[PDB]
Amino acid sequence: FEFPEELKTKLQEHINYFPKKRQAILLCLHEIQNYYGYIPPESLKPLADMLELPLNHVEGVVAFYDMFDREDKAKYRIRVCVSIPCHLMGTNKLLKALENILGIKPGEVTPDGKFKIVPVQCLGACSEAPVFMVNDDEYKFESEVQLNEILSRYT
Amino acid sequence: SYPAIPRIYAETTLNMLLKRAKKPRVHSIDEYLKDGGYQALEKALNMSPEEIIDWVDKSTLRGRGGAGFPTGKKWKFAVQNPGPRYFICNADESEPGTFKDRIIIERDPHLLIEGIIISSYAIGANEAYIYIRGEYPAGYYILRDAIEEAKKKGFLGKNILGSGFDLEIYVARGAGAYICGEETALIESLEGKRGHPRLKPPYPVQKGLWGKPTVVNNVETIANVPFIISMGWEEYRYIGPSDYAGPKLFPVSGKVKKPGVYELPMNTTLREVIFKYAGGTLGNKKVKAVFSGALDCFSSEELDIPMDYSPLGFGGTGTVIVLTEEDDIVEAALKIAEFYEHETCGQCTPCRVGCYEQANLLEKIYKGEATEQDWEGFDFVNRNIQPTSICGLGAVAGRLIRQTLEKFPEEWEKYRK
Numbered sequence: 001f002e003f004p005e006e007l008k009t010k011l012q013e014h015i016n017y018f019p020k021k022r023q024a025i026l027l028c029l030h031e032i033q034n035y036y037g038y039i040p041p042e043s044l045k046p047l048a049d050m051l052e053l054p055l056n057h058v059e060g061v062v063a064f065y066d067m068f069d070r071e072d073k074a075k076y077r078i079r080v081c082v083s084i085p086c087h088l089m090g091t092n093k094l095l096k097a098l099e100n101i102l103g104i105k106p107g108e109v110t111p112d113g114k115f116k117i118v119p120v121q122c123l124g125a126c127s128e129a130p131v132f133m134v135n136d137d138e139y140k141f142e143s144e145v146q147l148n149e150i151l152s153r154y155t
Numbered sequence: 156s157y158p159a160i161p162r163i164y165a166e167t168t169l170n171m172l173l174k175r176a177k178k179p180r181v182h183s184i185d186e187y188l189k190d191g192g193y194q195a196l197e198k199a200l201n202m203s204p205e206e207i208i209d210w211v212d213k214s215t216l217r218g219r220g221g222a223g224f225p226t227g228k229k230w231k232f233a234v235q236n237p238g239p240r241y242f243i244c245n246a247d248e249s250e251p252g253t254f255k256d257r258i259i260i261e262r263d264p265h266l267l268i269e270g271i272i273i274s275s276y277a278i279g280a281n282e283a284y285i286y287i288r289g290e291y292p293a294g295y296y297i298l299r300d301a302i303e304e305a306k307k308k309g310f311l312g313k314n315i316l317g318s319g320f321d322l323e324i325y326v327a328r329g330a331g332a333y334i335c336g337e338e339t340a341l342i343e344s345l346e347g348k349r350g351h352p353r354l355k356p357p358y359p360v361q362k363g364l365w366g367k368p369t370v371v372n373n374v375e376t377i378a379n380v381p382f383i384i385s386m387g388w389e390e391y392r393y394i395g396p397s398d399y400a401g402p403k404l405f406p407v408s409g410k411v412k413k414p415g416v417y418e419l420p421m422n423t424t425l426r427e428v429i430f431k432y433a434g435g436t437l438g439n440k441k442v443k444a445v446f447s448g449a450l451d452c453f454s455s456e457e458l459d460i461p462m463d464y465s466p467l468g469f470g471g472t473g474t475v476i477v478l479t480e481e482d483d484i485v486e487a488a489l490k491i492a493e494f495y496e497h498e499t500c501g502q503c504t505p506c507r508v509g510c511y512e513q514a515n516l517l518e519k520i521y522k523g524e525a526t527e528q529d530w531e532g533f534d535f536v537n538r539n540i541q542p543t544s545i546c547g548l549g550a551v552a553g554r555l556i557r558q559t560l561e562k563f564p565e566e567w568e569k570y571r572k
């Protein structure tokens with residue numbers, strides 16, 4: 001397993017950025033996930049080598065940090081706040097709307113591999129509850145019609 | 156071009172931290188300079204580090220990240236130990252209800268950067284870090300760009316403005332763990348490790364990043380520093396009541412008409428926050444409770460308390476989550492239990508098992524499936540998360556829930572029957 005040049009170049013930027021190589025581990029793992037739609041288990045050994053770290057160190061880090069997903073590939077992660085106060089302000093309605101539009105529940109991926117619903121703790125936008133993200137983009141849920149239009153922007 | 160972010164409402168009676176950040180847009184360096192930005196830095200670099208520490212001490216500034224440690228005193232402790240030293244901005248803000256820090260980061264990044272540079276100079280740190288939670292991607296990109304702006308204007312790098320002071324600011328990203336806001340866990344994460352808190356003592360100010368003296372400060376804390384230098388510590392102390400001076404941000408959410416971030420003096424009462432500033436309650440329903448993030452539960456009998464650091468004050472980080480008369484307190488308690496279940500790092504046995512069991516058992520209670528032994532077990536676990544804990548999470552994971560048991564017995568009773 002080898003990283004494509006375009007990805008390897010970015011990883012190398014991260015690794016050269018901090019005073020010590022190993023400090024770049026989370027930036028690198030974010031970069032890997034954004035490229036492949038998940039963290040391929042095969043990617044960890046060559047990442048470890050670039051960071052000058054043992055494989056088990058990198059494995060332990062991937063396991064600890066919730067944002068990283070070793071199991072399911074998805075183009076777009078729909079992170080849905082399942083905390084408080086989002087629960088008062090209509091998380092349930094957001095989840096129902098997502099089920100109506102995409103046919104999936106929290107934890108599931110669409111058959112085409114396009115969308116995965118990821119339940120998350122507070123996203124720090126509680127005044128704009130109920131909150132969700134689509135990869136890096138973050139939104140307030142207003143209604144199914146509004147949500148449907150938002151999701152149509154991700155192709 | 157940045158990722159989409161919700162336009163959180165922001166209002167200020169003081170026009171300090173939200174002077175620019177009351178507008179939901181990035182204020183870049185040229186606009187910041189037009190407001191007198193970076194002039195406090197220039198002033199600071201003509202002062203001795205010791206004088207800056209003295210001003211920040213006399214300002215009475217205290218940490219805005221939840222523990223309320225006096226900032227100047229913290230800095231004094233760090234400079235008692237030989238360098239090199241490190242400065243860290245904590246932008247991990249991940250507690251339920253808390254969204255005050257992000258609006259500084261996303262809208263007025265140069266206010267934060269200016270504070271970081273001054274603070275770093277004060278403690279003699281030539282390397283500073285911002286650790287921003289992974290779920291704030293826009294904030295990360297905005298900060299990276301703002302830092303490059305500052306570097307191009309000569310406010311970062313070597314020999315800043317001819318002062319002989321060198322600084323670089325690095326931006327690190329978290330990856331989904333609330334515990335990485337705990338200052339020693341944050342340092343572990345910066346070192347490229349799992350975010351596990353360290354046994355204290357030692358404290359970071361003695362042994363922190365790479366075992367060197369390290370000051371960790373919250374975003375909001377740091378954003379006060381340019382004001383202290385610009386205005387002088389006396390003028391800063393005239394803001395708000397004598398005993399609790401300075402601006403404070405209050406993120407207000409739940410069942411209010413105008414949820415958002417309010418910049419207010421600390422003599423404001425909880426009642427005023429809700430009714431005078433945040434427009435009262437949705438449907439004008441009665442307030443049942445206020446959750447101070449995931450820390451404390453205040454009843455409707457406790458709304459006349461000051462939003463200050465006093466023994467009888469609101470305290471915490473000033474996070475105000477409003478529940479009204481129709482909201483189920485047990486359901487809300489379950490949400491808090493779920494948070495602590497998800498976020499314990501699991502190093503300490505009573506925290507690991509206690510956070511898990513508290514949520515597990517409360518879910519059974521909520522669903523009407525709990526046995527009598529489950530109820531007894533729940534009470535016991537709730538009182539026994541803290542033993543042997545080496546960070547604040549274990550100490551508080553049962554606190555709010557215990558307050559709901561004491562303040563809303565009737566509601567819990569319905570579930571027991």
Ligand SMILES: Cc1cc2nc3c(=O)[nH]c(=O)nc-3n(C[C@H](O)[C@H](O)[C@H](O)COP(=O)(O)O)c2cc1C
Binds near residue numbers: 245
């Ligand atoms: C579980 C836990 C989570 C914390 N999360 C944060 C956080 O997100 N941001 C923050 O600045 N402080 C957080 N703190 C407090 C920090 O440990 C530390 O007190 C603070 O960053 C110091 O800065 P200050 O003196 O400016 O408040 C947390 C503490 C604990 C125990």
Ligand code: SF4
Binds near residue numbers: 502
């Ligand atoms: S108290 Fe809990 S969160 Fe803190 S170090 Fe121990 S197990 Fe981890």
Ligand code: FES
Binds near residue numbers: 121124
């Ligand atoms: S509770 Fe959902 S963003 Fe905070």
Ligand code: NA
Binds near residue numbers: 093096097100144
């Ligand atoms: Na719907």
Ligand code: NA
Binds near residue numbers: 394396
């Ligand atoms: Na005053």
